[PDB]
Amino acid sequence: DIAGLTPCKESKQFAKREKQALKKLQASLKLYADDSAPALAIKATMEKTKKRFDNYGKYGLLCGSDGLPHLIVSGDQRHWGEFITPGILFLYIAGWIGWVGRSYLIAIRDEKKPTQKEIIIDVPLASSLLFRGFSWPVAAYRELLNGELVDNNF
Amino acid sequence: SAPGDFGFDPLGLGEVPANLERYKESELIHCRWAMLAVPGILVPEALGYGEWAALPGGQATYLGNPVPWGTLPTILAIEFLAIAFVEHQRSMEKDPEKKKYPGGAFDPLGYSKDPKKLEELKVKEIKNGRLALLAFVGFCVQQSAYPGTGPLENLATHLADPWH
Amino acid sequence: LAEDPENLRWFVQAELVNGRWAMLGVAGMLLPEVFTSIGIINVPKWYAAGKEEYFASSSTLFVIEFILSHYVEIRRWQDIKNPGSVNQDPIFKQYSLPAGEVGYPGGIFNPLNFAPTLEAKEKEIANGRLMLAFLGFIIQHNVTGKGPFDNLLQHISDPWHNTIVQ
Amino acid sequence: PSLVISLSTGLSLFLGRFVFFNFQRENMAKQVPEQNGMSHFEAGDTRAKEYVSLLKSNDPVGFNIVDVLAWGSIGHIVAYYILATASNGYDPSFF
Ligand code: CLA
Ligand SMILES: CC(=CC=C/C(C)=C/C=C/C=C(C)/C=C/C=C(C)/C=C/C1=C(C)CCCC1(C)C)/C=C/C1=C(C)CCCC1(C)C
Ligand SMILES: CC1=C(/C=C/C(C)=C/C=C/C(C)=C\C=C\C=C(C)\C=C\C=C(C)\C=C\C2=C(C)CCCC2(C)C)C(C)(C)CCC1
Ligand SMILES: CCCCCCCCCCCCO[C@H]1O[C@H](CO)[C@@H](O[C@H]2O[C@H](CO)[C@@H](O)[C@H](O)[C@H]2O)[C@H](O)[C@H]1O
């Protein structure tokens, strides 16, 4: 739709890629497996990149010249989850990497001599402060900016 | 949300307590001139019958080629020199007693004064002021978008969403 | 420092608004189930009044209502920093004045209060969730379906369907 | 279409606001104060500035614009000449 061309529903250049290129894959008139039970170009590796026919799903997917598919993601016509869908995902996953970074850390500096407890690991991954992340509804999105890490501590 | 509670003195207050809104009194009387302009329709029903419309030949053409060209530059050029009259006088004041740049008058009791021309009470100018400002800025954008047409309502509902 | 919580105000009021709107949300469904036949998205419109005009549009509707919801909501704001709502039965509850053995701070667990006659915001506790998580449920299962329960002929037994989408 | 002389009209609006004071009080340059030779020392440095002296002819020589800018621009510059034209002179209305 946008700058490159249209998706899969038609994309000539893209088609030619399917075809030569892979299929030459072929390329081996035979090469012996008439019945034989190993050499697997034969089945999929092609067909797994191939039966990926005039279907790939359908994904929209813009495809420029040479018909390799370009990613817009401007949240329109079709292309939204080529960044946000896998974007918030990157956010949510990290941040629950370091929410617990700022956790199997802010749980130590106390009691008795706490000077490298960390070259070994107290609860592995933290396996205690663990889920604190999925057990973030809202969380740092409020309690980070109000209290605890409070400007005070700023 | 600019008057979302914030401001101290010469800047904060000082600039505005009447001062800027007393200068925003002009805004209202400009929008009294402009709402002395729009009322061209202003009312349904009376004639014009038919006022300087779409350029046919200005005031009286002049015995000689009109100075630049158009009605606009000749009526314009002057306006911004013959009105600098007021703002000169409006920008020579001070609030308490007036002498020169005198001895020492900052604060004892009575506390300076109040916008020179304060509220003096009648806190009703402002209640109509921001009322007018809110209009000029506000749904005056009912007629500040694509108003190539005019008045011709024909029954249905009201409103039209985001567009264009 | 603030040992620990906290909060309070906070998001206990956080909930009840979930609770009591998940409750309503499901009045939504209630309808099409006994004398049944009529719903899903049914992207309503939503009940629709008279034969004297609309007509697809006359207007965004929907879009407005909630300009309203909007300053009424600033109002509940307009409450919870500084306690103001006559009844006073969400912010802690009613039973006028009280509960606020947690309004000036120092909770830990604090259970609460609030019916004069009589009992509580409690077994309105647990209709409280039944319905939040219900929705979770409710617009869980669409994304493939939309109906409950006949008899023992051939319905309630799950016969054949069709992944997730995939 | 363009008022070209809309604005050269306009710019020596302002630098006649220039023709100013070569005339009126005392010498040039509010006499070289400080120019060559070099300020006290001064020194940080340094002065002066004064939010308080944007008057004097605000009112008077705000006319200067309408001078040349009227009758001497779009209305054919000094028609009232003659004053030694024979090695030539004129001069002659391109307008
Ligand atoms: C838990 C950890 C943690 C957290 C919250 C942070 C946070 C931060 N780091 Mg950082 N960092 C870390 C570990 C961490 N780091 C480590 C181990 C290193 C290697 C020395 C660095 C080297 C580093 C550099 C050079 C810079 C930062 C910067 C920053 C800041 C910018 C974020 C960024 O884009 O860098 C992305 C994060 C990294 C490159 C860090 C890689 C290490 C991660 C993967 C730690 C993962 C957790 C780890 C396994 C702990 C074990 C868990 C345990 C509880 C059991 C941000 C405050 C930047 C800064 O100062 O600006 C504010 C700066 O450019 N970091
Ligand atoms: C979650 C994630 C991740 C990851 C990964 C990661 C997260 C990675 C990271 C890494 C890190 C690093 C790699 C670091 C490093 C460090 C460094 C490099 C440093 C250096 C230095 C220092 C230390 C300081 C200074 C000096 C120097 C420079 C030397 C994501 C996921 C995903 C994917 C697949 C895609 C899509 C989206 C999602 C779905 C979401
Ligand atoms: C829509 C969109 C967009 C927009 C953008 C922008 C505008 C940006 C900016 C941005 C920014 C402006 C950012 C910033 C922010 C701030 C801050 C401040 C942040 C933060 C923070 C923090 C602090 C965090 C922390 C943490 C966590 C949470 C995790 C763990 C711990 C840690 C540390 C990590 C983009 C571009 C993307 C593209 C397209 C899409
Ligand atoms: C519930 C979530 C926490 C909410 C806490 C309340 C704090 C919210 C911030 C409001 C303070 C507003 O201040 C900030 O507004 C916008 C920037 O942020 C900008 O300002 C913008 O809106 C302001 C109104 O406040 C006005 O300036 C104009 O409308 C516009 O410029 C200014 O850059 C800044 O002054």
GROMACS .gro file of N, CA and C in nm, chain A residues 9-100:
model
  276
    9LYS      N    1  -0.109  -1.053  -0.185
    9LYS     CA    2  -0.225  -1.066  -0.272
    9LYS      C    3  -0.187  -1.036  -0.421
   10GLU      N    4  -0.086  -0.946  -0.440
   10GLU     CA    5   0.001  -0.943  -0.562
   10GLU      C    6   0.129  -0.860  -0.543
   11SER      N    7   0.239  -0.914  -0.601
   11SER     CA    8   0.380  -0.871  -0.579
   11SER      C    9   0.478  -0.939  -0.676
   12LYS      N   10   0.441  -0.953  -0.805
   12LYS     CA   11   0.530  -1.008  -0.915
   12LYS      C   12   0.675  -1.035  -0.874
   13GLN      N   13   0.752  -0.930  -0.843
   13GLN     CA   14   0.895  -0.941  -0.808
   13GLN      C   15   0.920  -1.043  -0.699
   14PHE      N   16   0.845  -1.028  -0.590
   14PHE     CA   17   0.833  -1.125  -0.482
   14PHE      C   18   0.809  -1.267  -0.540
   15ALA      N   19   0.719  -1.282  -0.637
   15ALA     CA   20   0.684  -1.415  -0.688
   15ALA      C   21   0.811  -1.486  -0.739
   16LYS      N   22   0.878  -1.421  -0.836
   16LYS     CA   23   1.007  -1.462  -0.895
   16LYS      C   24   1.110  -1.506  -0.794
   17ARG      N   25   1.105  -1.445  -0.673
   17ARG     CA   26   1.192  -1.481  -0.561
   17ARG      C   27   1.154  -1.619  -0.507
   18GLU      N   28   1.027  -1.641  -0.485
   18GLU     CA   29   0.980  -1.768  -0.443
   18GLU      C   30   1.049  -1.869  -0.517
   19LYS      N   31   1.078  -1.845  -0.641
   19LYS     CA   32   1.061  -1.948  -0.741
   19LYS      C   33   1.195  -1.982  -0.787
   20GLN      N   34   1.269  -1.886  -0.837
   20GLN     CA   35   1.409  -1.908  -0.863
   20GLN      C   36   1.494  -1.829  -0.771
   21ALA      N   37   1.597  -1.889  -0.722
   21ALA     CA   38   1.606  -1.891  -0.583
   21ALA      C   39   1.543  -2.020  -0.558
   22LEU      N   40   1.467  -2.027  -0.452
   22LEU     CA   41   1.455  -2.153  -0.387
   22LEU      C   42   1.478  -2.265  -0.484
   23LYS      N   43   1.403  -2.272  -0.591
   23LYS     CA   44   1.344  -2.396  -0.630
   23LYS      C   45   1.451  -2.467  -0.699
   24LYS      N   46   1.568  -2.415  -0.677
   24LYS     CA   47   1.679  -2.445  -0.757
   24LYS      C   48   1.771  -2.494  -0.657
   25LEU      N   49   1.735  -2.473  -0.533
   25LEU     CA   50   1.697  -2.583  -0.451
   25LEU      C   51   1.699  -2.700  -0.538
   26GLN      N   52   1.644  -2.686  -0.655
   26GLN     CA   53   1.617  -2.803  -0.732
   26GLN      C   54   1.749  -2.854  -0.775
   27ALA      N   55   1.783  -2.844  -0.900
   27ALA     CA   56   1.920  -2.809  -0.919
   27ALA      C   57   1.997  -2.934  -0.909
   28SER      N   58   1.927  -3.038  -0.871
   28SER     CA   59   1.994  -3.162  -0.842
   28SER      C   60   1.917  -3.279  -0.891
   29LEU      N   61   1.922  -3.300  -1.020
   29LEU     CA   62   1.811  -3.351  -1.093
   29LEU      C   63   1.763  -3.445  -0.993
   30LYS      N   64   1.840  -3.548  -0.976
   30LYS     CA   65   1.831  -3.631  -0.861
   30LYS      C   66   1.952  -3.611  -0.777
   31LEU      N   67   1.981  -3.706  -0.691
   31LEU     CA   68   2.092  -3.689  -0.598
   31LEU      C   69   2.056  -3.757  -0.468
   32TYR      N   70   2.099  -3.881  -0.459
   32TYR     CA   71   2.016  -4.004  -0.459
   32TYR      C   72   1.925  -4.036  -0.338
   33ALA      N   73   1.797  -4.037  -0.363
   33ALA     CA   74   1.707  -4.060  -0.250
   33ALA      C   75   1.569  -4.106  -0.300
   34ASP      N   76   1.576  -4.191  -0.405
   34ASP     CA   77   1.460  -4.248  -0.478
   34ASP      C   78   1.348  -4.308  -0.390
   35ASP      N   79   1.379  -4.316  -0.260
   35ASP     CA   80   1.311  -4.401  -0.163
   35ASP      C   81   1.391  -4.388  -0.034
   36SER      N   82   1.512  -4.330  -0.047
   36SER     CA   83   1.612  -4.327   0.060
   36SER      C   84   1.565  -4.240   0.177
   37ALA      N   85   1.605  -4.278   0.299
   37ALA     CA   86   1.552  -4.211   0.421
   37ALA      C   87   1.639  -4.106   0.502
   38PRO      N   88   1.734  -4.029   0.437
   38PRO     CA   89   1.798  -3.909   0.499
   38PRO      C   90   1.778  -3.772   0.429
   39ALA      N   91   1.842  -3.754   0.311
   39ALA     CA   92   1.887  -3.624   0.258
   39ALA      C   93   1.777  -3.520   0.230
   40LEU      N   94   1.748  -3.436   0.330
   40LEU     CA   95   1.614  -3.372   0.346
   40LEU      C   96   1.590  -3.233   0.282
   41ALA      N   97   1.652  -3.204   0.167
   41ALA     CA   98   1.621  -3.079   0.097
   41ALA      C   99   1.483  -3.106   0.047
   42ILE      N  100   1.481  -3.194  -0.052
   42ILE     CA  101   1.374  -3.294  -0.075
   42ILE      C  102   1.240  -3.263  -0.002
   43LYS      N  103   1.234  -3.292   0.128
   43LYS     CA  104   1.118  -3.259   0.212
   43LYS      C  105   1.151  -3.136   0.296
   44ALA      N  106   1.065  -3.036   0.287
   44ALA     CA  107   1.079  -2.911   0.360
   44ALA      C  108   1.224  -2.863   0.348
   45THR      N  109   1.266  -2.773   0.438
   45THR     CA  110   1.381  -2.684   0.414
   45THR      C  111   1.353  -2.600   0.289
   46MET      N  112   1.307  -2.669   0.182
   46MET     CA  113   1.219  -2.610   0.081
   46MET      C  114   1.077  -2.598   0.143
   47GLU      N  115   0.984  -2.689   0.112
   47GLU     CA  116   0.845  -2.692   0.166
   47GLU      C  117   0.818  -2.621   0.302
   48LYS      N  118   0.920  -2.608   0.388
   48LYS     CA  119   0.901  -2.530   0.515
   48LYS      C  120   0.929  -2.381   0.492
   49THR      N  121   1.019  -2.350   0.398
   49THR     CA  122   1.030  -2.215   0.340
   49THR      C  123   0.943  -2.200   0.217
   50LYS      N  124   0.888  -2.313   0.169
   50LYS     CA  125   0.817  -2.319   0.039
   50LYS      C  126   0.667  -2.328   0.051
   51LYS      N  127   0.615  -2.431   0.118
   51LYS     CA  128   0.470  -2.452   0.119
   51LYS      C  129   0.411  -2.323   0.170
   52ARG      N  130   0.498  -2.244   0.235
   52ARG     CA  131   0.493  -2.099   0.228
   52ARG      C  132   0.475  -2.051   0.082
   53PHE      N  133   0.363  -2.095   0.024
   53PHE     CA  134   0.317  -2.068  -0.112
   53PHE      C  135   0.274  -1.923  -0.127
   54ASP      N  136   0.185  -1.900  -0.223
   54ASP     CA  137   0.101  -1.780  -0.234
   54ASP      C  138   0.027  -1.750  -0.102
   55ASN      N  139   0.075  -1.813   0.006
   55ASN     CA  140   0.035  -1.788   0.144
   55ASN      C  141   0.165  -1.775   0.222
   56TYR      N  142   0.164  -1.692   0.323
   56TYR     CA  143   0.275  -1.687   0.417
   56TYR      C  144   0.212  -1.669   0.554
   57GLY      N  145   0.081  -1.699   0.555
   57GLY     CA  146  -0.022  -1.625   0.632
   57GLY      C  147  -0.102  -1.533   0.537
   58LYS      N  148  -0.062  -1.405   0.533
   58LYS     CA  149  -0.104  -1.306   0.432
   58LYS      C  150  -0.059  -1.167   0.475
   59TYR      N  151  -0.053  -1.148   0.609
   59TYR     CA  152   0.021  -1.039   0.680
   59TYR      C  153   0.024  -0.900   0.623
   60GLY      N  154  -0.050  -0.874   0.516
   60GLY     CA  155  -0.022  -0.758   0.435
   60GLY      C  156   0.122  -0.778   0.391
   61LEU      N  157   0.211  -0.696   0.447
   61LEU     CA  158   0.358  -0.693   0.419
   61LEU      C  159   0.393  -0.642   0.281
   62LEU      N  160   0.457  -0.524   0.284
   62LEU     CA  161   0.462  -0.425   0.175
   62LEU      C  162   0.543  -0.462   0.052
   63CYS      N  163   0.666  -0.510   0.073
   63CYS     CA  164   0.746  -0.565  -0.036
   63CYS      C  165   0.777  -0.455  -0.137
   64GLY      N  166   0.904  -0.417  -0.147
   64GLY     CA  167   0.947  -0.309  -0.237
   64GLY      C  168   0.986  -0.368  -0.371
   65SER      N  169   1.092  -0.315  -0.434
   65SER     CA  170   1.147  -0.380  -0.555
   65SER      C  171   1.257  -0.486  -0.523
   66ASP      N  172   1.262  -0.590  -0.606
   66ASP     CA  173   1.317  -0.720  -0.567
   66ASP      C  174   1.221  -0.791  -0.468
   67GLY      N  175   1.124  -0.715  -0.413
   67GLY     CA  176   1.004  -0.771  -0.349
   67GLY      C  177   1.030  -0.832  -0.214
   68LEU      N  178   1.151  -0.809  -0.163
   68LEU     CA  179   1.179  -0.829  -0.022
   68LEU      C  180   1.091  -0.727   0.052
   69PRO      N  181   1.025  -0.770   0.162
   69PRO     CA  182   0.915  -0.700   0.225
   69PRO      C  183   0.962  -0.597   0.323
   70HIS      N  184   0.907  -0.477   0.315
   70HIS     CA  185   0.954  -0.370   0.400
   70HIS      C  186   0.854  -0.352   0.510
   71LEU      N  187   0.902  -0.300   0.623
   71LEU     CA  188   0.819  -0.273   0.743
   71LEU      C  189   0.796  -0.125   0.763
   72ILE      N  190   0.670  -0.081   0.751
   72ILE     CA  191   0.632   0.057   0.772
   72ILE      C  192   0.611   0.074   0.922
   73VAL      N  193   0.498   0.020   0.967
   73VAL     CA  194   0.447   0.035   1.104
   73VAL      C  195   0.436   0.186   1.145
   74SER      N  196   0.318   0.239   1.112
   74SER     CA  197   0.281   0.380   1.130
   74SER      C  198   0.136   0.373   1.181
   75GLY      N  199   0.089   0.249   1.192
   75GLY     CA  200  -0.043   0.221   1.251
   75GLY      C  201  -0.158   0.267   1.165
   76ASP      N  202  -0.180   0.192   1.057
   76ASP     CA  203  -0.266   0.237   0.950
   76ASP      C  204  -0.302   0.115   0.866
   77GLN      N  205  -0.359   0.142   0.748
   77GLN     CA  206  -0.397   0.041   0.645
   77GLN      C  207  -0.395  -0.109   0.684
   78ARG      N  208  -0.281  -0.158   0.731
   78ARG     CA  209  -0.276  -0.290   0.795
   78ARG      C  210  -0.165  -0.301   0.900
   79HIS      N  211  -0.057  -0.225   0.882
   79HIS     CA  212   0.066  -0.255   0.952
   79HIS      C  213   0.075  -0.177   1.082
   80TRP      N  214   0.042  -0.248   1.191
   80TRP     CA  215   0.043  -0.192   1.328
   80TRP      C  216   0.134  -0.276   1.417
   81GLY      N  217   0.119  -0.408   1.412
   81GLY     CA  218   0.192  -0.498   1.502
   81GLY      C  219   0.321  -0.552   1.441
   82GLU      N  220   0.404  -0.459   1.393
   82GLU     CA  221   0.537  -0.489   1.337
   82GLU      C  222   0.635  -0.407   1.420
   83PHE      N  223   0.584  -0.359   1.533
   83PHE     CA  224   0.662  -0.278   1.624
   83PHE      C  225   0.597  -0.266   1.762
   84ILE      N  226   0.469  -0.230   1.765
   84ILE     CA  227   0.400  -0.207   1.889
   84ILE      C  228   0.372  -0.344   1.945
   85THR      N  229   0.283  -0.422   1.880
   85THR     CA  230   0.261  -0.565   1.920
   85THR      C  231   0.392  -0.635   1.965
   86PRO      N  232   0.501  -0.628   1.884
   86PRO     CA  233   0.623  -0.682   1.933
   86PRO      C  234   0.710  -0.573   1.997
   87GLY      N  235   0.648  -0.458   2.026
   87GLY     CA  236   0.719  -0.344   2.087
   87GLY      C  237   0.692  -0.339   2.236
   88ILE      N  238   0.564  -0.329   2.275
   88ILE     CA  239   0.529  -0.332   2.417
   88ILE      C  240   0.587  -0.463   2.471
   89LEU      N  241   0.578  -0.567   2.387
   89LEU     CA  242   0.633  -0.695   2.422
   89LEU      C  243   0.779  -0.681   2.465
   90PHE      N  244   0.864  -0.615   2.383
   90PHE     CA  245   1.004  -0.589   2.424
   90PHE      C  246   1.014  -0.508   2.551
   91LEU      N  247   0.925  -0.408   2.565
   91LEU     CA  248   0.924  -0.330   2.685
   91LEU      C  249   0.891  -0.420   2.802
   92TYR      N  250   0.771  -0.480   2.803
   92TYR     CA  251   0.721  -0.559   2.917
   92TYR      C  252   0.822  -0.663   2.967
   93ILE      N  253   0.884  -0.736   2.871
   93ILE     CA  254   0.983  -0.840   2.901
   93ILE      C  255   1.109  -0.782   2.974
   94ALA      N  256   1.185  -0.696   2.906
   94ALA     CA  257   1.278  -0.610   2.976
   94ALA      C  258   1.196  -0.526   3.079
   95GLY      N  259   1.263  -0.458   3.171
   95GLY     CA  260   1.184  -0.387   3.273
   95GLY      C  261   1.127  -0.487   3.373
   96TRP      N  262   1.085  -0.604   3.326
   96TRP     CA  263   1.069  -0.714   3.419
   96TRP      C  264   1.194  -0.801   3.418
   97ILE      N  265   1.299  -0.750   3.352
   97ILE     CA  266   1.435  -0.801   3.363
   97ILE      C  267   1.505  -0.720   3.471
   98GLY      N  268   1.477  -0.591   3.473
   98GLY     CA  269   1.547  -0.494   3.559
   98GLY      C  270   1.461  -0.438   3.672
   99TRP      N  271   1.329  -0.458   3.664
   99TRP     CA  272   1.244  -0.435   3.781
   99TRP      C  273   1.298  -0.526   3.887
  100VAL      N  274   1.340  -0.643   3.842
  100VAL     CA  275   1.403  -0.739   3.929
  100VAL      C  276   1.556  -0.716   3.938
   0.00000   0.00000   0.00000
